[PDB]
Amino acid sequence: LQYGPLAFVLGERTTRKLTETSKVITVDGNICSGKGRLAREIAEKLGLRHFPEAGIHYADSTTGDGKPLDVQLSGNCSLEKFYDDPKSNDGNSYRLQSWLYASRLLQYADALEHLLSTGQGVVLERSIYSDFVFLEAMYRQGFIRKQCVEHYNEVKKVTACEYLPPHVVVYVDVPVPEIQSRIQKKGNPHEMKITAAYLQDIENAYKKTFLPEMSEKCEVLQYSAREAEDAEKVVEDIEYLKCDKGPWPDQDDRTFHRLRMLVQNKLEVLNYTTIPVYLPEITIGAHQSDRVFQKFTELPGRKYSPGYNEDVGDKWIWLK
Amino acid sequence: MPLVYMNIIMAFAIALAGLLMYRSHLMSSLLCLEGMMLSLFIMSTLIILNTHFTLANMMPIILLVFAACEAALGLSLLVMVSNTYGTDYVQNLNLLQC
Amino acid sequence: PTIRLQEDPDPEDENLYEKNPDSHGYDKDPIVDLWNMRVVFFFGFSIVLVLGSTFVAYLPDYRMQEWARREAERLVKYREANGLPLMESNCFDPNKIQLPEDED
Amino acid sequence: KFYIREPPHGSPDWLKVGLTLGTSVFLWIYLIKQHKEDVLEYKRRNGLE
Amino acid sequence: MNPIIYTTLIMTVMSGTMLVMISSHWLLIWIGFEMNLLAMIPVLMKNFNPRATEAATKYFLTQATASMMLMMAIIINLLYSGQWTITKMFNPVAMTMMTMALAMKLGLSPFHFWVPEVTQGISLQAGLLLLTWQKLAPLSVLCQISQSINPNLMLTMAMLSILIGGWGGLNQTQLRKIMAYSSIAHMGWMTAVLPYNTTMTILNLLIYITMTLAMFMLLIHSSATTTLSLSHTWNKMPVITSLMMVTLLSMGGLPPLSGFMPKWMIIQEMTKNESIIMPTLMAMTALLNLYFYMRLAYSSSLTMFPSTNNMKMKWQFEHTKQMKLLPTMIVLSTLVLPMTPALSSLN
Amino acid sequence: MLKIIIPTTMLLPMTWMSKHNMIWINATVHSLLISLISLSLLNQLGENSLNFSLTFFSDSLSAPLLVLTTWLLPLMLMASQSHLSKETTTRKKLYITMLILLQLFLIMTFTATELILFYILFEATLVPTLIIITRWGNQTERLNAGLYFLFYTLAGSLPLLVALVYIQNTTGSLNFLIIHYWSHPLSNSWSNIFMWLACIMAFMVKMPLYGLHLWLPKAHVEAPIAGSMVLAAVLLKLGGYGMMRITTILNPLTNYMAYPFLMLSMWGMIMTSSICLRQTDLKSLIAYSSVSHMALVIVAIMIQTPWSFMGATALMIAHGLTSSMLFCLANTNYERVHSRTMILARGLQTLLPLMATWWLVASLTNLALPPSINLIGELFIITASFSWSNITIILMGMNMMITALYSLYMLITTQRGKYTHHINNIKPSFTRENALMALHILPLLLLTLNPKMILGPLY
Amino acid sequence: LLDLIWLETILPKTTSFIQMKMSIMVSNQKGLIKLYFLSFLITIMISMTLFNYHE
Amino acid sequence: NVLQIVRDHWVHILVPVGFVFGCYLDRRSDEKLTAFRNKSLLFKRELRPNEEVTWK
Amino acid sequence: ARQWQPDVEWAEQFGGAVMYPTKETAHWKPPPWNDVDPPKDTLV
Amino acid sequence: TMMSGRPGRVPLQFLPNEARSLPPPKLTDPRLVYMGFLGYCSGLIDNAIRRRPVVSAGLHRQLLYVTSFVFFGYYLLKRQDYMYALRDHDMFAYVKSHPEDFPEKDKKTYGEILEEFHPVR
Ligand SMILES: CCCCCCCCCCCCCCCCCC(=O)OC[C@H](COP(=O)([O-])OCC(O)COP(=O)([O-])OC[C@@H](COC(=O)CCCCCCCCCCCCCCCCC)OC(=O)CCCCCCCCCCCCCCCCC)OC(=O)CCCCCCCCCCCCCCCCC
Ligand SMILES: CCCCCCCCCCCCCCCCC[C@@H](O)O[C@H](CO[C@H](O)CCCCCCCCCCCCCCC)COP(=O)(O)OCC[N+](C)(C)C
Ligand SMILES: CCCCCCCCCCCCCCCCC[C@@H](O)O[C@H](CO[C@H](O)CCCCCCCCCCCCCCC)COP(=O)(O)OCC[N+](C)(C)C
Ligand SMILES: CCCCCCCCCCCCCCCCC[C@@H](O)O[C@H](CO[C@H](O)CCCCCCCCCCCCCCC)COP(=O)(O)OCC[N+](C)(C)C
Ligand SMILES: CCCCCCCC/C=C\CCCCCCCC(=O)O[C@H](COC(=O)CCCCCCC/C=C/CCCCCCCC)COP(=O)(O)OCCN
Ligand SMILES: Nc1ncnc2c1ncn2[C@@H]1O[C@H](COP(=O)(O)OP(=O)(O)O)[C@@H](O)[C@H]1O
């Protein structure tokens, strides 16, 4: 039985599967920080489920086969081109920003669905609550316009208000010269073109806005570059927290039922991402839309429902 | 038709006109609604008492019961309106204009 | 962006005579093209046109125009042999008509 | 292939198919029997056969 | 809201409507109306926001005034004849009061003002309920006392409703207000034939209920509440937009679609009496409803509007919950005209 | 007559189940077979109709129209399969479905034995045409053209429905046979005058009458080639069929009620014919010529003589064929140069000789060259009008002088002169286009060989 | 003068203008229940005076 | 070879089958209008000693 | 060469508060994307 | 209105006993075939909406659609025929019981009736 009103009237309640160790955690940091490894260590030590940071092709991994699709069919944006030409006149910067925000929203919905269906906790490498800093980094450097900022703000206001903030916010603080040195030592040619002002803007928006905002409703555990390697210390710091300030203690069975109905039905989650606001950077013409949609339909397992595609090995179709 | 029936009908008409006119407060409109209920109850009671309809005597009581429901309903809505605006002014209820 | 949409450019016309010098103007695939031409010509010019015109030209005279001619010849012969006016101005026999007795 | 197991099973739901076919067959048999009964009843009333 | 409480409220609304239908007593019909309104008010407020509270308050005030007038009409009828049975309504003043109260409950012009705002102020499910199930009881009461319907008042209100719905629908961009104005026009069409034949009224009611259910279920499937938000559906659900266009054409009244049958039968029934001018005016006025239906069809199905990039992600996700009877409702809303004589099973 | 109706409803699923690259072949072949089958309806009786069943019947007026429709469908498919090459298979099947539904509705319309069913199918024909025009048109004027086409028709047709139901209530039946046998004169009353107007105005709009014709130039120009063909060839003749079916009950009121329309039909005949002299768009020129010819048909129907009816039937058939051929010829140049301006592409006889002779024969047929059926119908109508009034010839004569004046003019503008220099994308004419022109033009000559088949029941 | 100006003016353009004006007049309401219930009172009084009198 | 070509061109029999069905339905329809068969004042004819109906 | 389809300029005429903008309703604003007006920060 | 109140009518029968004296509709009735076609169309639309192969996705559910539509249509046709038979029976009885309101007029031949002639010219 798929979860719904019928499964709620009889039997299934979610407050009987929350076991005080759920503690939705998002690990946060500037570019080229050890936040990913720290998140993985925290997840494998606390017994939670780790979510790798949502990229351009995150949605492709959760639908059909996990293999990513073409950039023209999903995303229509690349990070390498943003690093090469951040001021390109085709609108790649804000298109990438909006696609990344939608991917993060989808990942947050999936994490919340897993948490409310199994009771197991989740660890995230970023969230929709901290994506905006990158947006600000594009605005202060002149990469995007003010109308793009307004559209982002409208979408965030109509989307993120329906979910619960994470219990614990973990921040890995690494100074700008150190992350610049790490980028130099990394080896990716495209990342070498990141100016210091971009990272400084990210850090400024991160310290001045994100952390103060999440302080009033989440447990914020700031760290340093040297404190990140010893993940056992971070884990035992998490085990001795008091999650008493957020809206989580004020959640009943009915609110949890509404949230669980919302986190599934990913179409409902993504509804307000495609509002009819005609920004030139993200608006697509009728001919291009039709061509790309027809190309997407021609994919091996995308013409029909996930159980009615004969050309991927689905048998007994006529009896379903 | 006696004069008392005419007075009761005039009272009902006055209460209906008072409801149809809105000044500022929703409370006054609810008061007019309860006044219409009272006038209907009085008219029904007089009619049922004049013509000795014994089994009809309970039906005004039922009327009063549903009156409370309406009043209750209105009060609930009024509270929400106040919680949205701090006043029960009908001028604030204009969001559905556009 | 100094533009308004992410729109595909208008493609140029594809000349059918380029990849197929004998293209018949029916389809890009030469085999389906040739068979479309053949079926159009056979069922349009050969079957419907000529055979249908032959069928129309030899339709039986359900309109009864030679019958009317023969009847007219017989009637004319009879009436001329009996010295009759060959046609009466009254389509129906006046004896079977009851006019109003008076109009005054 | 599919990353998820496609909740609607790759083999058809034998229970659902079973009772769907069963109710279709039952409806058809009931309709046939009803038609025969009304034919006989109408013939009996009107004195035809 | 708790699912059990929501089910109880919906069942209470349905039970109030059933009580109105199955009661031979005026007091019991009034009690059914009261129960219907009492249980219906929270349903409009299931999703809490200032607009829902606005719609609930306006609906409650309108229905309370209509109930007051209905009870006064019942009391006057009792005064002039000691009868409690829903019958010929021996008094004309009480009969006029009942006609006006029921017209205000239905939303007939000039009491239509509440319909566009309430429908816009509530969700699509609440709008579906309001525009489909809430019209049964007042229409049933009107049918039961059709012998004493004053033809002048009822026909004037019906013509006003048709004209006002047709004119108001032209100016609307939001879909809920368009549906409300179409509801007002169809209410006028239904009530115009009421004094002559209630079977035609029931047939029009059934055809409208089918079409409205199909329309609202399509608008819920494609989560669109505005014209431009519906312009994005072709890039995700072309079949849904095509079915929506066919359903809109059916509501327009074009043959051989289902929507032509009710107006055709009503025109025939009216022309069985003398009644020549009024059906002609009704048709030339329903032309406006067809016009804004066609405008919606242009914006939604017959042209391809620009889309957004994020829609690509929506391409990878199917619908979680599918509404039942949507294909059946679409089929009944389009391909039913050849079965027109079956209306003889309605009297 | 279900032996013709059912094969179209079988064209539907065969098209929807054919493979992607075989839809056009199957559709064309089976439509040609259906037209061959329907050709058997031309064996008409001399006194009464062919009463097949209680719902369908055929006489010598509806049979040529049915044959014309069944023959026109394959031509529409042939011309449509060129500009829909890049279209997806589903939408190509949808277009073919629209055409098939239009043909089926027309077939049922031309043989409905009672007036309400005829009206229902007559309005049902509107939906496929509107969808075609507003979905597969090229310019942004297609929306307004579709709106005009829909509302002009409906505004005149709803009062027709009211009048029809009133007539059925008064007399008890609307079957054409019972209506004709039980016909009674109409009194000189205001109620009878408005009943006449309600019965006549729908078909006046569908002709269209001069004054209510503004929808036709919009609809015929913005529509795709198949839509233009079906509009000019068949859909304009629905009004004529309805007029010559319903005028039996309108007598003797018509004797004094046709006076305005006749004037609008005659003077307008001149006016539209003059407009073609100053038209910078080829499709608009063809549309206005269609308007003038249909006004002549209106005159023929209104004056109501046997010669008038024979001429009207002949002119309807001839104009349908001629307008279809002219629209196809214009569309060939449009696909060549992607513009509808007449003086853009000039001197095409040098580069397209066979297409030039197709243009010449189409223009010669348009201006009523003897002994074509165009001239037969026009001359019969002219003789009937001269019997009606000896002054009408003047106007008639004027029209003739204007008609050729623009016809050859178009032939001179597009085909003669010198070629435009910068245009270098004029490819040789394809076999499909030449076959389409031949299949348009050969039936005209074969019909003037045996013209009694298109002279109507009055023959 | 005739086709593009006056024939357009009489039938379709006048109809469109009148329908647009009537739509603007009808639809544009202030959204306040005070005016709506004032109109309801006026309608009730008119119906009582006009239709009810002529029984 | 028969299987694939049949599964490819089975759609070419729909129209001939439709025409045959239409002819059969026309026969069934016009066999219901025999209320005046051999009863016309113009075609009342004596039945031959071997036939049973003037027309089918 | 290709079929004309609506653009942003064409679509923006269906994105207003009401059709046929006038002087009185020029200052009307379309309702929020989700039908949730911002909470009025009423002073307590 | 007209048929709502009739003597000896059970309220919610939907099929009175006296309806069994009428010939039942044939199973090959064209209206029943149309109802089956409606069921098939409903099944096809169900397949198309849920993004499944329209022609061949679910055969059992399409069969259920068709049989449900046919099943409902059979009783719908029975009730329709019964109501039309009732209408004709009532009309004939009313005509028979009121001879003065439906008198048989004198038969006149076209040779006696004088119809005015309107020439066309
Ligand atoms: C009167 C006479 C009879 C007529 C009756 C009425 C018409 C017929 C009934 C109509 C209802 C039935 C089907 C409706 C649901 C189907 C939906 C659909 O899309 O079909 C896809 C489907 C193909 O899709 P697929 O194979 O799954 O894979 C491709 C993907 O789906 C690809 O999917 P996609 O996502 O890419 O598709 C996108 C596309 C999809 O959009 C659509 O396809 C539109 C869907 C139609 C809307 C239906 C609305 C309700 C019906 C009302 C009809 C009104 C009729 C009155 C006239 C007015 C016309 C509007 O949308 C667009 O591209 C936008 C284009 C805009 C066009 C606007 C016009 C649309 C409305 C026109 C409706 C007219 C009727 C069409 C009937 C056939 C349509 C399939 O089509 C079919 O295969 C079904 C056709 C019928 C099957 C018959 C086969 C049975 C066996 C054959 C043999 C017969 C007996 C043999 C025995 C003999 C002895 C040997
Ligand atoms: C490219 C090279 C060009 C130059 C070379 C030309 C080669 C030689 C051609 C020149 C010869 C000219 C022909 C001379 C006339 C002879 C034919 C004539 O005798 O046949 C006519 C017959 O013509 C046909 O009837 C024409 C049929 C009409 C067309 C059929 C329709 C085909 C379907 C196409 C769709 C049409 C849709 C439009 C609505 C109908 C006469 O009719 P009729 O005297 O009585 O019947 C004679 C038989 N009888 C005596 C037993 C009665
Ligand atoms: C753009 C093109 C649109 C189509 C145009 C169609 C035209 C339709 C007009 C139909 C003509 C006949 C209508 C009236 C019949 C008689 C004409 C009128 O002069 O009547 C006279 C009567 O004198 C007065 O004129 C009476 C009528 C006065 C009112 C009519 C004026 C309307 C103004 C014109 C408006 C333009 C029409 C289009 C409107 C949208 C005749 O005197 P009389 O012999 O004793 O009466 C004969 C009729 N009876 C026997 C039934 C009584
Ligand atoms: C587009 C079509 C919409 C149709 C709406 C839904 C279709 C399914 C209908 C559901 C069938 C069950 C309903 C009732 C069955 C058993 C109950 C039985 O007792 O009902 C009796 C009789 O059943 C119903 O009355 C008739 C229901 C039949 C509905 C079908 C008619 C549709 C109109 C024609 C359009 C063509 C549709 C073709 C099929 C889709 C009631 O008798 P009565 O107490 O005396 O009526 C009181 C009200 N009156 C007197 C004023 C009428
Ligand atoms: C593209 C635009 C075309 C517009 C065409 C629309 C107008 C068509 C002409 C008017 C049609 C309406 C006529 C009504 C239907 C006919 C029914 C009838 O004639 O019955 C008469 C009823 O006649 C009427 O009632 C007709 C009243 C007309 C009301 C509608 C007015 C519409 C506009 C009228 C003026 C314009 C007409 C011509 C316009 C031409 C288009 C420009 C007899 O009924 P009884 O009452 O029983 O009388 C006998 C017992 N004493
Ligand atoms: N909202 C965003 N906007 C632009 N770029 C982003 C955004 N989110 C992530 N990125 C890019 O994704 C890249 C990888 O992120 P990061 O976590 O810092 O590296 P790593 O995975 O090695 O730890 C970075 O170069 C970062 O710039």
Swiss-Prot record, chain B:
GO terms for biological process: ATP synthesis coupled electron transport. It is a multi-pass membrane protein. Its EC number is 7.1.1.2. GO terms for cellular component: mitochondrial inner membrane; respiratory chain complex I. Belongs to the complex I subunit 4L family. Core subunit of the mitochondrial membrane respiratory chain NADH dehydrogenase (Complex I) which catalyzes electron transfer from NADH through the respiratory chain, using ubiquinone as an electron acceptor. Part of the enzyme membrane arm which is embedded in the lipid bilayer and involved in proton translocation. This is NADH-ubiquinone oxidoreductase chain 4L. The lineage of its organism: Eukaryota, Metazoa, Chordata, Craniata, Vertebrata. The gene is MT-ND4L.
UniProtKB/Swiss-Prot annotation, chain E:
It is found in: Mitochondrion inner membrane. This is NADH-ubiquinone oxidoreductase chain 2. Belongs to the complex I subunit 2 family. Core subunit of respiratory chain NADH dehydrogenase (Complex I) which is composed of 45 different subunits. Interacts with TMEM242. It catalyses: a ubiquinone + NADH + 5 H(+)(in) = a ubiquinol + NAD(+) + 4 H(+)(out). The keyword Oxidoreductase does not apply. InterPro entries: Complex_I_Subunit_2, NADH_DH_su2_C, NADH_UbQ_OxRdtase_chain2, ND/Mrp_TM. Its EC number is 7.1.1.2. The chain crosses the membrane at residues 3-23, 25-45, 59-79, 89-109, 149-169, 178-198, 200-220, 237-257, 274-294, 325-345. It is an enzyme of class 7 (translocase). Keywords: Electron transport, Membrane, Mitochondrion, Mitochondrion inner membrane, NAD, Respiratory chain, Translocase, Transmembrane, Transmembrane helix, Transport, Ubiquinone. It holds the Pfam family Proton_antipo_M. It is a multi-pass membrane protein. Core subunit of the mitochondrial membrane respiratory chain NADH dehydrogenase (Complex I) which catalyzes electron transfer from NADH through the respiratory chain, using ubiquinone as an electron acceptor. Essential for the catalytic activity and assembly of complex I. GO terms for cellular component: mitochondrial inner membrane; respiratory chain complex I. It comes from the Eukaryota. GO terms for biological process: mitochondrial electron transport, NADH to ubiquinone; mitochondrial respiratory chain complex I assembly; reactive oxygen species metabolic process. One of its GO terms (molecular function) is NADH dehydrogenase (ubiquinone) activity.
